[PDB]
Amino acid sequence: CVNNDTLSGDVYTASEAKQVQNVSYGTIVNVRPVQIQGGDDSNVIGAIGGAVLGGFLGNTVGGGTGRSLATAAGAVAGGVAGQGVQSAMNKTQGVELEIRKDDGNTIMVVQKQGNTRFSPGQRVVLASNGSQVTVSPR
Amino acid sequence: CVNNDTLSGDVYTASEAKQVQNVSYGTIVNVRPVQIQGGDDSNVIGAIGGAVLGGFLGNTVGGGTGRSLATAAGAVAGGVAGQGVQSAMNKTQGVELEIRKDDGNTIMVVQKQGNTRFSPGQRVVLASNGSQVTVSPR
Amino acid sequence: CVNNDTLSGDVYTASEAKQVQNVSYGTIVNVRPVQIQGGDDSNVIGAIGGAVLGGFLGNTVGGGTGRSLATAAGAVAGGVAGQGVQSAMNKTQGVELEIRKDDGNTIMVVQKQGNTRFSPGQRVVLASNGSQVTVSPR
Amino acid sequence: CVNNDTLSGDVYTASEAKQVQNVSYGTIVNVRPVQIQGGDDSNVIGAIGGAVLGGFLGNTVGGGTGRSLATAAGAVAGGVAGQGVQSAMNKTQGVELEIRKDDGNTIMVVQKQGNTRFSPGQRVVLASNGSQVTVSPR
Amino acid sequence: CVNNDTLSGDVYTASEAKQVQNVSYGTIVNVRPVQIQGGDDSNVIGAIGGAVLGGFLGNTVGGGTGRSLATAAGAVAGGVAGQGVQSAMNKTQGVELEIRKDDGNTIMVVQKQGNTRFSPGQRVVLASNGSQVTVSPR
Amino acid sequence: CVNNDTLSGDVYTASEAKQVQNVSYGTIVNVRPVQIQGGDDSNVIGAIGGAVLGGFLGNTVGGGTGRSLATAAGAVAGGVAGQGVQSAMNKTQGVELEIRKDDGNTIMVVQKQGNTRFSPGQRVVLASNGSQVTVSPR
Amino acid sequence: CVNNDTLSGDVYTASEAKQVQNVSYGTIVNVRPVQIQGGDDSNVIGAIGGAVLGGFLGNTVGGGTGRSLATAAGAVAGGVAGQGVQSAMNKTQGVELEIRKDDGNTIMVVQKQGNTRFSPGQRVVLASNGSQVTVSPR
Amino acid sequence: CVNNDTLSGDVYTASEAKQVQNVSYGTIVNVRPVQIQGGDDSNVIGAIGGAVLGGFLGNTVGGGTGRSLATAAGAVAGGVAGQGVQSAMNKTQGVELEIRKDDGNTIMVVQKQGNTRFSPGQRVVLASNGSQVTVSPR
Amino acid sequence: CVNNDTLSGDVYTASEAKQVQNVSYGTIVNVRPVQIQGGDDSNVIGAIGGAVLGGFLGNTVGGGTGRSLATAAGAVAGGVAGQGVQSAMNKTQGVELEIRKDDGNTIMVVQKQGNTRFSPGQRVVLASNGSQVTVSPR
Amino acid sequence: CVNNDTLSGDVYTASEAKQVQNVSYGTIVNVRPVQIQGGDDSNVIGAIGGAVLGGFLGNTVGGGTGRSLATAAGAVAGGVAGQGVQSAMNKTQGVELEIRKDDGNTIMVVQKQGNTRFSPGQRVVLASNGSQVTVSPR
Amino acid sequence: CVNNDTLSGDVYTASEAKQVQNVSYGTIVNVRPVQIQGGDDSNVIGAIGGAVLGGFLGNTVGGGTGRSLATAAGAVAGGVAGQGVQSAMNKTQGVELEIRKDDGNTIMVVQKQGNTRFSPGQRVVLASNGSQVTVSPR
Numbered sequence A, B, C, D, E, F, G, H, I, J, K: 001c002v003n004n005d006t007l008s009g010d011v012y013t014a015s016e017a018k019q020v021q022n023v024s025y026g027t028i029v030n031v032r033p034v035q036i037q038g039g040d041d042s043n044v045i046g047a048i049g050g051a052v053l054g055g056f057l058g059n060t061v062g063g064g065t066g067r068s069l070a071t072a073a074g075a076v077a078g079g080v081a082g083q084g085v086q087s088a089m090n091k092t093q094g095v096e097l098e099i100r101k102d103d104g105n106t107i108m109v110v111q112k113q114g115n116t117r118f119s120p121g122q123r124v125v126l127a128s129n130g131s132q133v134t135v136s137p138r
């Protein structure tokens, strides 16, 4: 598992506490919903778990030289299902926001859904660092 | 398997959440369909799976010194089929779009087919970063 | 465990004693509560502890070739719970402060809750270094 | 095997989707046919497969100390044939095109044969990147 | 253990003897007490000691296959307590001083409590190097 | 073996497909025939093959302590012949051409013999890259 | 042990013999006594010695499965005492001197106590190198 | 063995085919014969071959503890002869030529003897690259 | 042992023979005696010798499980004495000289005592290199 | 052995064939004879050969525990003689020449004796490269 | 052993043959005798030889557990003597020369004694390179 709950507007990772961050103001338009896929593309941990759990389910059939074939088939047929499952428990739902600043410049930012509802027409304050931004309501 | 579903216009990888992205506008012409081939060219994981599953199907014929020949032949004849199959499950279908911006400059971008249909003559908004672009309808 | 108690306004890590730090003054507005998530995202130590403690609970059922299946299942079903638990004991509660300096510039800083209560309207003194800040009351 | 089907004008590798590419126009003259040789020059995978399959065909003759000689001879006499065969299944047929752009500058590009026929006298559109080009008909 | 007694105003580490250090003068205001946490955040030595001492307390109960479960549980239940204890014996008490120099510039420095008492209103002499300072009374 | 058939004027390596190449014109004079020696100077693969095939031909004579001498002699007397043979199957025949460009500058290039005959007095077109050239007839 | 007797004003390390050193003059004020702590903070050699000497004192009590517990407890209870003792035999006594040069500039230097007594009001000669100084009486 | 036949005026190494080379003209004077010594100075492959072939010729004399002495002596007395012989089969015969160019500048180049005879007074054409030259007759 | 006899004015290390060195003249004042401590601070070779020689003196007392305790105690009680002795045989006696050059500049140099006596008031010649000096009498 | 016969005026190493070298003229004065010492200073190959050949000559005397002493003594007493002999077969005889060029500049070069005699008063031609020179008679 | 006979005025190392060296003239004054110490300061090869030869002289006394003590003592008591002897066979005798050039500049150089006698008042010629010099008589 990967704990991608540090991608909300209500939780800070501990490597950015006790630092300085700048402040700007803006306005909000055109929110639409979006899905977020964390983790890594080459799933390795799922493969090994699936492989062992599928292989040890193979010994219990047959006997002789027909048992080795069963365990060998079960190994790969569980290995692929491991990657099948390990990349469907790392999928959350978020929103995409288009904010227009008071400078006159427009940007958009994507952020995980929490327990506050964003609406078209509102005032937000941007807490920013070098290439990092958090958006919080009024 | 490789999870190339992060190449759509409705799914964001989690390493580009909580960042700033610029906004432009444009118009759409000349969409045509295209196929997309993910993964890597040197298939290694397919070779080993094919090899073991083909080798363990060789012991069950013959006996003596004619069993070793059977298992040795089965090993390679399954090894090549492993790469044959592992590079036909990583093939998806997408579209290629030619968008003309309001600057007066023309570009084209290629993107995976989803559940929205693009048509000739429409307004799109480009969300851009340094050498990254996502296209979404009006 | 990770000892993230060095993120308070009353405890200094020992690698920043006997050094020089600058002093500024400011005023405080708009405190709101926030949670803090320490540690690292890829939980490794939890996985091994969960795995061993789940595996050694598997031998005590069944016998023959039905014991191996039980221990193999218990191993992974404890492995995932290890990461489930090891990333819920590293979660503390803090505050977020917006301070306006006497220069005329505005910043905000996030800091762990202690035993002093911050209120809207107060005088604070910032002890600063290069990209490090501690806030302490009057 | 090497999957050199990403060298056509109808298939895009997945590492160049969702990017920006420029557009130019031109005219076509002097197409002639050409062969294309993929892969790598030092064939290693063919050698091992040929070696094992030739060696295990050696035990079945003779007995005593005249069996070792047979297996040793078969090993190398299959090893060289492995490289003989593994570099004749990576050979495709393509075309070479000489296109004159509307700038007044002339270039030529080589590309794999597909299912569309190029003729002398036609209009093509070049989709280009930094040192990458794809040619597609009108 | 970590010997953090070289963080006082009466003990010099031996890698800064026979060197040259500059001298300044100042005045002292606003001392307040503070705690100091040495060592390192990832406690490793505590984990192994706790693990072995907890594991060898497990064999003495039960017998058969119920002994392995006891030793496995004791191992982790002592492992976490090892880190619990090894990071509570590296905690000392010090003071924080705000000194105003004769230049007209203000700084503050934090230093371990010894056997001399600092008071508001006094003369101190700063012995300094590049980014190192020791404060000693008149 | 080394597959040096990518050194002709009718076969392109697959790492230079879908790229841009410049075009020039010229005239041809003074072709003379030449031999080409591929591969590498320190022959290693030939040594091991020769060594094993010569050594296993030594056991079949004599017995006692006079067999070890025979196998030891055969090993080296086959080892040197391995390098003798492995560097006589990598030798092809090509031509050397002196072409005078329309600029007024003269160069010469060497290229493997194919199935087209070059003659003194003819028109050729040079397809060029940075320090790469292919010559093809009119 | 660490031989920190090369930190006196009467002993030179052998890597700074046969070199050139500059000469200055000064005057001496305000000597006060100080302690010096050599060695390294992470004590490793003490831990192993304490561990072995404590462990081999554990076998001599009890018998059965109650001997293993005794040796395991003795190991750690001697391990910590090893670091307790190995960092109390590397502690010497020295002096701190404030010397005012004839330039008009003031410095202070710290140096191990020997067999000569420094007094307030005296003439000293500084033998100096790049960031190295030795002070010797008249 | 080392195949130093790529040092003639009639054989090209395959890493310099399909490249561009410049052309100059000159005249020839003062050819004299010279020997050429290829390979490497520290002969390693000869030592091992000589050592094994000399050692296995030692067992066939004597018996008891007088056999070990014989094999040990034979090992080194064959080892040195290995380097004696392996550096006398890498010695060829060539010529040294002094050519005066039409610029007015003089150079000389050394090249292996082939099947063409160079004479004093003749016209040669130099095919050159960066610090590489081949000389061929009219 | 360390052979620190190359620190005299009558012995040259062999890495500075056949080189060029400059010559200057001067005068000598204020010689005083000094001790020199060679070697390295972390004594390793003494520890192992002391450890083995102390450990093998432990077996000769007692028997049973009271022999292991004796050998374990002897090991460390000889280990520390090894470092005690190995750093008292690398201590020589030298002199420190203050020489005033004819330029008008003053320096001092430290050098091992030999068989010539230096006196206040004498002429010396300095043989110098880059940051190396030897002093020899008239 | 080291084959230092490539240091004559009649043998070229094969890494400097087919290159360009410049030509100068001069005159010869003051030849005197000199010895040349090749190889490397730390003789390793001689030590091992001497060691084995001396050790295997030790078993043939005595018996019991007096044989081990003999073999141990013979090992080192042959080891030193190995380096004694291996550095007396790499010693050749050469000449040193002082040549005055037609520029007006003087140099000298040292070169191995061959089969031509140099005399005072003669004309030589220098074939030169960057920091390489060969001298050959008229 | 180390062969430091390449530090004379009559023997050239073979890595500086066939190179160019400059020539100067001078005059000679004030030769005095000096000793030269080659090799390296940390003697390793002597330690092992002394250790083995001393250890194998220990078994021949006593029996039981009193033999181990004898061999252990002999090992170190021979080990130190190994370094005692291995650094007294690398000591030669040379001379130090002060030469005044015709420029008007003075230098001195140190060189091993040979079979020619240098006297006060003579003419020498310096053969020089970058930071290398050899001095030879008229």
Ligand SMILES: CC/C=C/CCCCCCC[C@@H](O)CC(=O)N[C@H]1[C@@H](OP(=O)(O)O)O[C@H](CO[C@@H]2O[C@H](CO[C@]3(C(=O)O)C[C@@H](O)[C@@H](O)[C@@H]([C@H](O)CO)O3)[C@@H](OP(=O)(O)O)[C@H](OC(=O)C[C@@H](CCC/C=C/CCCCCC)OC(=O)CCCCCCCCCCCCC)[C@H]2NC(=O)C[C@@H](C/C=C/CCCCCCCC)OC(=O)CCCCCCCCCCC)[C@@H](O)[C@@H]1OC(=O)C[C@H](O)C/C=C/CCCCCCCC
Binding pocket: A053, A057, A060, C057, C058, C060, C061, C062, C063, C064, C065, C066, C067, C069, C070, C073, C074
């Ligand atoms: C707070 C919570 C605390 C937690 C833990 C604390 C509890 C501690 C209390 C300790 C008490 C315990 O000591 C008592 C005891 O065990 N006592 C036991 C002990 O006696 P003692 O007391 O020790 O003296 O031993 C006896 C011996 O048992 C048998 O011994 C034979 C050999 O023994 C012999 C011999 O011939 O050599 C003869 C004998 O006389 C003697 O001499 C021995 C001698 O010992 C030599 O060593 O040797 C074996 O044949 P073999 O070896 O030659 O092959 C045989 O297994 C055999 O031959 C082969 C077996 C194997 C087939 C079972 C697999 C099912 C597939 C499910 C996956 C689904 C896929 C999607 O085959 C069979 O058993 C045939 C069953 C056919 C029907 C199956 C239907 C199931 C599917 C339904 C699906 C429904 C869908 C809707 C074996 N059965 C056996 O050992 C037992 C076998 C019986 C199957 C019951 C079905 C349950 C399946 C439901 C699934 C759960 C939800 C997912 O059970 C097991 O192998 C363990 C099963 C684990 C499965 C986990 C699934 C993981 C998830 C999926 C992973 C992919 C047991 O009877 C005793 O009783 C019993 O054990 C009765 C017991 O009450 C039943 C077991 C319950 C455990 C289940 C929970 C596990 C969950 C996870 C754990 C972390």
Ligand SMILES: CC/C=C/CCCCCCC[C@@H](O)CC(=O)N[C@H]1[C@@H](OP(=O)(O)O)O[C@H](CO[C@@H]2O[C@H](CO[C@]3(C(=O)O)C[C@@H](O)[C@@H](O)[C@@H]([C@H](O)CO)O3)[C@@H](OP(=O)(O)O)[C@H](OC(=O)C[C@@H](CCC/C=C/CCCCCC)OC(=O)CCCCCCCCCCCCC)[C@H]2NC(=O)C[C@@H](C/C=C/CCCCCCCC)OC(=O)CCCCCCCCCCC)[C@@H](O)[C@@H]1OC(=O)C[C@H](O)C/C=C/CCCCCCCC
Binding pocket: I053, I057, I060, K057, K058, K060, K061, K062, K063, K064, K065, K066, K067, K069, K070, K073, K074
């Ligand atoms: C040019 C120069 C050439 C150089 C070399 C060439 C010489 C070659 C000639 C060969 C002849 C030789 O083959 C003859 C022979 O050995 N012949 C011998 C041979 O017969 P074969 O001919 O082989 O057939 O074997 C016999 C067997 O001997 C005994 O055998 C017992 C077991 O044997 C049994 C059994 O019961 O199992 C029974 C038996 O019947 C038979 O069956 C065997 C069978 O073989 C099974 O294997 O088994 C052992 O008991 P165990 O095993 O169960 O434990 C016993 O040792 C035992 O039980 C245990 C012993 C051990 C205690 C001794 C340690 C002393 C501490 C000093 C350190 C100071 C610290 C600061 O305990 C005792 O011996 C009790 C002694 C109590 C009094 C000690 C006082 C000393 C202190 C004084 C301090 C004064 C201060 C002012 C053992 N003694 C023994 O094996 C002998 C034991 C006797 C002690 C004498 C005191 C000397 C100490 C002075 C110190 C010197 C200066 C520093 O001696 C030794 O262990 C070697 C001692 C080495 C000490 C070196 C010190 C190093 C420096 C300090 C290091 C930190 C010997 O008698 C024969 O005679 C003898 O051996 C008599 C002999 O003349 C005496 C030995 C002299 C050697 C000394 C020189 C070494 C210096 C360095 C060398 C490089």
Ligand SMILES: CCCCCCCCCCCCCCCC(=O)OC[C@H](COP(=O)(O)O)OC(=O)CCCCCCCCCCCCCCC
Binding pocket: C048, C049, C052, E047, E048, E051, E052, E055, E056, E059, E067, E068, E071, E072, E075, E076, E079
């Ligand atoms: C941070 C979490 C770390 C988790 C690691 C714990 C591993 C637990 C292994 C259980 C071993 C059971 C063996 C079978 C039972 C038996 O009857 O075992 C019997 C045998 C000996 O008994 P006999 O005397 O009867 O032969 O072995 C033992 O008794 C071994 C002692 C068990 C305890 C060892 C301590 C744990 C390992 C060291 C800690 C390292 C931590 C590293 C953290 C990074």
Ligand SMILES: *C(=O)CCCCCCCCCCCCCCC
Binding pocket: A001, A002, A045, A046, A049, A050, A053, A054, A057, A077, A078, A081, A082, A085, A086, A089, C080
């Ligand atoms: C974080 O998520 C860590 C990785 C989690 C791996 C989960 C593995 C589950 C594998 C299930 C396989 C079922 C096999 C069924 C028989 C073929």
Ligand SMILES: *C(=O)CCCCCCCCCCCCCCC
Binding pocket: A080, B001, B002, B045, B046, B049, B050, B053, B054, B057, B077, B078, B081, B082, B085, B086, B089
């Ligand atoms: C992601 O896709 C991981 C790699 C998947 C590998 C799939 C391997 C399948 C191999 C089938 C081989 C069949 C052999 C039949 C007998 C020769």
Ligand SMILES: *C(=O)CCCCCCCCCCCCCCC
Binding pocket: C001, C002, C045, C046, C049, C050, C053, C054, C057, C077, C078, C081, C082, C085, C086, C089, E080
């Ligand atoms: C700091 O916090 C160190 C890591 C702590 C790891 C804690 C591991 C607890 C695992 C509990 C698993 C329970 C399994 C129950 C049966 C499946």
Ligand SMILES: *C(=O)CCCCCCCCCCCCCCC
Binding pocket: B080, D001, D002, D045, D046, D049, D050, D053, D054, D057, D077, D078, D081, D082, D085, D086, D089
């Ligand atoms: C992609 O193409 C992977 C490599 C394919 C290797 C194919 C190997 C075939 C070898 C056949 C050898 C036949 C030997 C017959 C007896 C000497």
Ligand SMILES: *C(=O)CCCCCCCCCCCCCCC
Binding pocket: E001, E002, E045, E046, E049, E050, E053, E054, E057, E077, E078, E081, E082, E085, E086, E089, G080
């Ligand atoms: C410096 O402080 C070195 C590290 C010290 C480690 C101390 C380890 C103490 C562990 C105590 C564990 C008690 C376990 C009780 C049964 C679970």
Ligand SMILES: *C(=O)CCCCCCCCCCCCCCC
Binding pocket: D076, D080, F001, F002, F045, F046, F049, F050, F053, F054, F057, F077, F078, F081, F082, F085, F086, F089
């Ligand atoms: C590409 O060419 C791969 C290397 C090919 C090696 C061929 C080895 C042939 C060796 C023949 C040796 C014959 C020995 C006869 C008895 C001494």
Ligand SMILES: *C(=O)CCCCCCCCCCCCCCC
Binding pocket: G001, G002, G045, G046, G049, G050, G053, G054, G057, G077, G078, G081, G082, G085, G086, G089, I080
């Ligand atoms: C230089 O000082 C080298 C390191 C010295 C280590 C000294 C170790 C002493 C350990 C004493 C432990 C006593 C244990 C008593 C029973 C628990």
Ligand SMILES: *C(=O)CCCCCCCCCCCCCCC
Binding pocket: F080, H001, H002, H045, H046, H049, H050, H053, H054, H057, H077, H078, H081, H082, H085, H086, H089
């Ligand atoms: C290319 O040339 C590869 C190296 C060739 C090595 C040849 C080795 C020949 C050794 C002959 C030794 C004869 C020993 C006779 C008894 C002492």
Ligand SMILES: *C(=O)CCCCCCCCCCCCCCC
Binding pocket: I001, I002, I045, I046, I049, I050, I053, I054, I057, I077, I078, I081, I082, I085, I086, I089, K080
């Ligand atoms: C150069 O000096 C090399 C290192 C020399 C090491 C000397 C070691 C001497 C150790 C003596 C120990 C006496 C132990 C007595 C019983 C405890």
Ligand SMILES: *C(=O)CCCCCCCCCCCCCCC
Binding pocket: H080, J001, J002, J045, J046, J049, J050, J053, J054, J057, J077, J078, J081, J082, J085, J086, J089
């Ligand atoms: C090139 O020269 C390779 C190294 C040659 C090593 C020669 C070794 C000769 C050793 C002779 C030793 C004689 C020992 C006599 C008894 C002590």
Ligand SMILES: *C(=O)CCCCCCCCCCCCCCC
Binding pocket: J080, K001, K002, K045, K046, K049, K050, K053, K054, K057, K077, K078, K081, K082, K085, K086, K089
């Ligand atoms: C070049 O000089 C190589 C190293 C030479 C090592 C010589 C070793 C001699 C050791 C003599 C030791 C005598 C021990 C006597 C009994 C203690």
